[PDB]
Write an enzyme that holds these catalytic residues in place. Structure first.
Site, PDB file in Angstrom:
ATOM      1  CB  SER A 172      -0.875  -0.021   1.260  1.00 20.87           C
ATOM      2  OG  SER A 172      -1.505   1.207   1.599  1.00 20.87           O
ATOM      3  CE1 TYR A 185      -2.064  -3.355   5.783  1.00 21.64           C
ATOM      4  CE2 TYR A 185      -1.696  -0.998   5.665  1.00 21.64           C
ATOM      5  CZ  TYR A 185      -2.120  -2.170   5.075  1.00 21.64           C
ATOM      6  OH  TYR A 185      -2.585  -2.146   3.786  1.00 21.64           O
ATOM      7  CE  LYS A 189       0.783  -5.046   3.316  1.00 19.59           C
ATOM      8  NZ  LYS A 189       0.783  -6.011   2.162  1.00 19.59           N
TER       9      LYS A 189
HETATM   10  N1  LIG Z   1      -8.405  -2.514   0.864  1.00 20.97           N
HETATM   11  C1  LIG Z   1      -7.548  -1.528   1.118  1.00 20.97           C
HETATM   12  O1  LIG Z   1      -7.885  -0.475   1.694  1.00 20.97           O
HETATM   13  C2  LIG Z   1      -6.116  -1.712   0.682  1.00 20.97           C
HETATM   14  C3  LIG Z   1      -5.360  -0.624   0.265  1.00 20.97           C
HETATM   15  C4  LIG Z   1      -4.065  -0.812  -0.187  1.00 20.97           C
HETATM   16  C5  LIG Z   1      -3.531  -2.079  -0.196  1.00 20.97           C
HETATM   17  N2  LIG Z   1      -4.268  -3.121   0.237  1.00 20.97           N
HETATM   18  C6  LIG Z   1      -3.626  -4.485   0.315  1.00 20.97           C
HETATM   19  O2  LIG Z   1      -4.434  -5.413  -0.357  1.00 20.97           O
HETATM   20  C7  LIG Z   1      -4.454  -6.666   0.364  1.00 20.97           C
HETATM   21  C8  LIG Z   1      -5.874  -7.026   0.714  1.00 20.97           C
HETATM   22  O3  LIG Z   1      -6.734  -5.899   0.431  1.00 20.97           O
HETATM   23  P1  LIG Z   1      -8.290  -6.151   0.160  1.00 20.97           P
HETATM   24  O4  LIG Z   1      -9.018  -4.860   0.168  1.00 20.97           O
HETATM   25  O5  LIG Z   1      -8.358  -7.021  -1.036  1.00 20.97           O
HETATM   26  O6  LIG Z   1      -8.705  -6.986   1.462  1.00 20.97           O
HETATM   27  P2  LIG Z   1      -9.987  -7.843   1.884  1.00 20.97           P
HETATM   28  O7  LIG Z   1     -10.114  -7.828   3.361  1.00 20.97           O
HETATM   29  O8  LIG Z   1     -11.139  -7.423   1.060  1.00 20.97           O
HETATM   30  O9  LIG Z   1      -9.564  -9.297   1.379  1.00 20.97           O
HETATM   31  C9  LIG Z   1      -8.268  -9.835   1.710  1.00 20.97           C
HETATM   32  C10 LIG Z   1      -8.330 -11.337   1.604  1.00 20.97           C
HETATM   33  O10 LIG Z   1      -7.145 -11.913   2.196  1.00 20.97           O
HETATM   34  C11 LIG Z   1      -7.503 -13.147   2.782  1.00 20.97           C
HETATM   35  N3  LIG Z   1      -6.511 -13.500   3.797  1.00 20.97           N
HETATM   36  C12 LIG Z   1      -6.250 -12.840   4.970  1.00 20.97           C
HETATM   37  N4  LIG Z   1      -5.392 -13.453   5.750  1.00 20.97           N
HETATM   38  C13 LIG Z   1      -5.063 -14.598   5.039  1.00 20.97           C
HETATM   39  C14 LIG Z   1      -4.225 -15.689   5.334  1.00 20.97           C
HETATM   40  N5  LIG Z   1      -3.563 -15.831   6.489  1.00 20.97           N
HETATM   41  N6  LIG Z   1      -4.132 -16.676   4.417  1.00 20.97           N
HETATM   42  C15 LIG Z   1      -4.842 -16.572   3.289  1.00 20.97           C
HETATM   43  N7  LIG Z   1      -5.667 -15.597   2.905  1.00 20.97           N
HETATM   44  C16 LIG Z   1      -5.741 -14.637   3.832  1.00 20.97           C
HETATM   45  C17 LIG Z   1      -8.906 -12.934   3.334  1.00 20.97           C
HETATM   46  O11 LIG Z   1      -9.600 -14.168   3.483  1.00 20.97           O
HETATM   47  C18 LIG Z   1      -9.535 -11.996   2.291  1.00 20.97           C
HETATM   48  O12 LIG Z   1     -10.375 -12.671   1.360  1.00 20.97           O
HETATM   49  C19 LIG Z   1      -3.512  -6.495   1.557  1.00 20.97           C
HETATM   50  O13 LIG Z   1      -2.224  -7.036   1.285  1.00 20.97           O
HETATM   51  C20 LIG Z   1      -3.488  -4.978   1.759  1.00 20.97           C
HETATM   52  O14 LIG Z   1      -2.305  -4.520   2.409  1.00 20.97           O
HETATM   53  C21 LIG Z   1      -5.537  -2.966   0.654  1.00 20.97           C
HETATM   54  C1  LIG Z   2      -7.274   3.297   8.054  1.00 16.03           C
HETATM   55  N1  LIG Z   2      -6.695   3.227   6.712  1.00 16.03           N
HETATM   56  C2  LIG Z   2      -6.202   2.126   6.130  1.00 16.03           C
HETATM   57  C3  LIG Z   2      -5.597   2.567   4.906  1.00 16.03           C
HETATM   58  C4  LIG Z   2      -4.824   1.970   3.886  1.00 16.03           C
HETATM   59  C5  LIG Z   2      -4.561   0.504   3.793  1.00 16.03           C
HETATM   60  O1  LIG Z   2      -5.223  -0.267   4.602  1.00 16.03           O
HETATM   61  O2  LIG Z   2      -3.691   0.082   3.053  1.00 16.03           O
HETATM   62  C6  LIG Z   2      -4.308   2.763   2.861  1.00 16.03           C
HETATM   63  C7  LIG Z   2      -4.544   4.125   2.822  1.00 16.03           C
HETATM   64  C8  LIG Z   2      -5.292   4.729   3.830  1.00 16.03           C
HETATM   65  N2  LIG Z   2      -5.455   6.143   3.893  1.00 16.03           N
HETATM   66  S1  LIG Z   2      -5.674   7.203   2.669  1.00 16.03           S
HETATM   67  O3  LIG Z   2      -6.239   6.501   1.558  1.00 16.03           O
HETATM   68  O4  LIG Z   2      -6.389   8.303   3.239  1.00 16.03           O
HETATM   69  C9  LIG Z   2      -4.075   7.776   2.195  1.00 16.03           C
HETATM   70  C10 LIG Z   2      -3.955   8.713   1.181  1.00 16.03           C
HETATM   71  C11 LIG Z   2      -2.701   9.175   0.821  1.00 16.03           C
HETATM   72  C12 LIG Z   2      -1.567   8.705   1.469  1.00 16.03           C
HETATM   73  O5  LIG Z   2      -0.286   9.117   1.185  1.00 16.03           O
HETATM   74  C13 LIG Z   2      -0.115  10.157   0.207  1.00 16.03           C
HETATM   75  C14 LIG Z   2       1.361  10.413   0.024  1.00 16.03           C
HETATM   76  C15 LIG Z   2       2.298   9.988   1.161  1.00 16.03           C
HETATM   77  C16 LIG Z   2       2.240  11.425   1.693  1.00 16.03           C
HETATM   78  C17 LIG Z   2       1.747  11.871   0.311  1.00 16.03           C
HETATM   79  C18 LIG Z   2      -1.709   7.756   2.484  1.00 16.03           C
HETATM   80 CL1  LIG Z   2      -0.300   7.138   3.292  1.00 16.03          CL
HETATM   81  C19 LIG Z   2      -2.956   7.287   2.854  1.00 16.03           C
HETATM   82  C20 LIG Z   2      -5.830   3.957   4.880  1.00 16.03           C
HETATM   83  N3  LIG Z   2      -6.515   4.367   5.979  1.00 16.03           N
END
Ligand SMILES: NC(=O)c1ccc[n+]([C@@H]2O[C@H](COP(=O)([O-])OP(=O)(O)OC[C@H]3O[C@@H](n4cnc5c(N)ncnc54)[C@H](O)[C@@H]3O)[C@@H](O)[C@H]2O)c1
Ligand SMILES: Cn1cc2c(C(=O)O)ccc(NS(=O)(=O)c3ccc(OCC4CCC4)c(Cl)c3)c2n1
Ligand SMILES: NC(=O)c1ccc[n+]([C@@H]2O[C@H](COP(=O)([O-])OP(=O)(O)OC[C@H]3O[C@@H](n4cnc5c(N)ncnc54)[C@H](O)[C@@H]3O)[C@@H](O)[C@H]2O)c1
Lengths: 271, 244
Positions: A172, A185, A189
């Site tokens: 992320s 987290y 990441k």
């Molecule tokens: N959704 C967001 O806000 C967001 C933003 C940026 C990056 N990400 C990244 O994307 C990934 C997931 O995001 P999402 O929105 O798709 O999540 P989500 O919660 O919608 O789905 C994630 C999936 O991962 C599976 N999972 C969790 N732990 C596991 C394990 N131990 N073994 C196997 N499967 C497992 C869950 O069953 C689920 O289906 C993460 O790596 C996260 O860091 C998410």
């Molecule tokens: C609680 N929660 C989980 C979030 C995850 C996740 O679960 O992965 C990812 C992003 C979030 N926040 S956001 O989208 O508002 C955002 C926008 C811009 C950014 O950074 C902009 C750049 C860095 C300086 C300028 C950053 Cl660091 C964040 C999340 N908030």
């Protein structure tokens, strides 16, 4: 009052919008085909993982889906089958090393040798450093980066023989800059972004051309992973999947979603 | 240069330094002993950390040593209670300790990867988590996260190590943003990011810095409260050019 200064950032995002879309058309990157490839996607039962399996099913690929949610990953496979893709699923704890290795041998005894890896799976426990549980920190690292090593490690020997593959590390913006409440987290990441950066330098240093690497770095995605974003866009589940499917096809190293977040990181190194 | 950063005093402070039996940790304890600080050293090498304390005592500082596996969570917590039952509440933390197993991703052992993360970043959470409450109460402290340029960009043969060093740089960055978001001012943060330091940690370089030169950069960065201590300072412009 603070909204006055915020319009400077809003003008630069629309400035990047036309600029980035002009490069994608005027001088566009070479799009490849991922048809008939063995694409493994961890955490493909919902959200970014589920919609990545939908996008790969569109590209006529050979899907292998891994997840802890048997129902969720089976329903993704069901909609991927309704598209024409060959899909075979496995309930794998993508944080447990002995389970991952055990299931890799079942992947080779059923599907074959994986050619594209999507380390999507992740876990989040939003809390301040003093309210976070030790078990949560351990589980964060076990899934977000420790697990990435074992999957990558079990499939890389075969991709090395064929000099053909693609390691997709899903991280992320929390891999480029830390946010409050998500210190365990963000720490994992950041590790995921560094694992891809080292994999890209070591693949290059060893003469390996055929194995490409992509890293997905989006902002808040509306998936239910957490409740609300940390700062004042909320990307959709499908929009992010289209960005990942387009980044893998052009072999881009850093897939920022939405792309302009690259210029924001540039301005961070000016204080 | 014209009107340069305000240097503070670290005299009489409780400085804990993990991995202080040799190299960057040993020479940091020498630099803090010069600043007239109350020192607490942690390490797995009983002989090494005792000899650092011996040369820190020969400078005038009050050094107390504890043999602590700075990767084991139950050992760290057990020794934090001994630190409070002997020295008091730590006011400056130096997360120096580290381990490296130079090899390609396919020749690295799983145990090595586990130990890498256990020391380089998992251990950094438990020591900070246990020393933070008293600092929060007093609104006074300093969390020093010792990472490498392998926290800003990955190098071959050190993928497990670079992955953990990147995590350390992000823990520092997350801690910084959360420290600011919670209204805490008194707790500062510094992160040491040097290139190849001649300590014997790794056999050959990836300019090459000396053991003592890096310690002087860390002692000067903590005193001016700088967030990112690049060693040497110019390696910041090289990282800028990488994003082009
Ligand atoms: N959704 C967001 O806000 C967001 C933003 C940026 C990056 N990400 C990244 O994307 C990934 C997931 O995001 P999402 O929105 O798709 O999540 P989500 O919660 O919608 O789905 C994630 C999936 O991962 C599976 N999972 C969790 N732990 C596991 C394990 N131990 N073994 C196997 N499967 C497992 C869950 O069953 C689920 O289906 C993460 O790596 C996260 O860091 C998410
Ligand atoms: C609680 N929660 C989980 C979030 C995850 C996740 O679960 O992965 C990812 C992003 C979030 N926040 S956001 O989208 O508002 C955002 C926008 C811009 C950014 O950074 C902009 C750049 C860095 C300086 C300028 C950053 Cl660091 C964040 C999340 N908030
Ligand atoms: N030396 C370098 O080339 C270099 C460069 C940049 C950053 N660093 C960072 O500096 C740190 C150490 O560098 P160095 O040159 O001082 O190393 P070193 O090998 O000279 O000494 C490190 C010390 O850490 C101790 N240690 C290791 N594992 C421990 C554990 N589990 N519990 C307690 N103590 C433990 C060792 O006993 C040793 O005395 C690491 O965090 C490393 O990432 C080193």
């Amino acid at each position: 009052g603070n909204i006055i200064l915020d319009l400077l950032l809003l003008l630069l995002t629309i400035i990047y919008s036309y600029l980035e879309a002009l490069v994608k058309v005027f001088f566009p990157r070479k799009r490849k085909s991922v048809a008939g490839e063995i694409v493994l996607i961890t955490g493909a039962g919902h959200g970014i993982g589920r919609w990545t399996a939908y996008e790969f099913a569109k590209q006529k690929s050979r899907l292998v889906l891994w997840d802890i949610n048997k129902h969720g990953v089976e329903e993704t496979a069901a909609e991927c089958r309704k598209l024409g893709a060959t899909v075979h699923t496995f309930v794998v704890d993508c944080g447990n090393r002995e389970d991952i290795y055990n299931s890799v041998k079942q992947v080779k005894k059923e599907v074959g040798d994986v050619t594209i890896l999507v380390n999507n799976a992740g876990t989040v426990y939003p809390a301040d450093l003093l309210s976070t549980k030790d078990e949560e920190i351990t589980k964060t690292f076990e899934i977000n980066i420790l697990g990435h090593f074992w999957i990558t490690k079990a499939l890389l020997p075969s991709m090395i023989k064929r000099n053909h593959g693609h390691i997709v590390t899903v991280a992320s913006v929390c891999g480029h800059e830390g946010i409050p409440y998500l210190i365990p987290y963000c720490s994992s990441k950041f590790a995921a972004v560094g694992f891809h950066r080292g994999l890209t330098s070591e693949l290059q240093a060893l003469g390996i051309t055929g194995i490409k690497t992509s890293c997905l770095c989006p902002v808040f995605v509306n998936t239910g992973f957490t409740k609300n974003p940390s700062t004042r866009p909320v990307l959709e589940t499908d929009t992010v999947a289209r960005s990942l499917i387009d980044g893998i096809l052009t072999n881009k190293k850093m897939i920022f979603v939405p792309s302009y977040i690259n210029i924001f990181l540039i301005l961070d190194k000016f204080l």
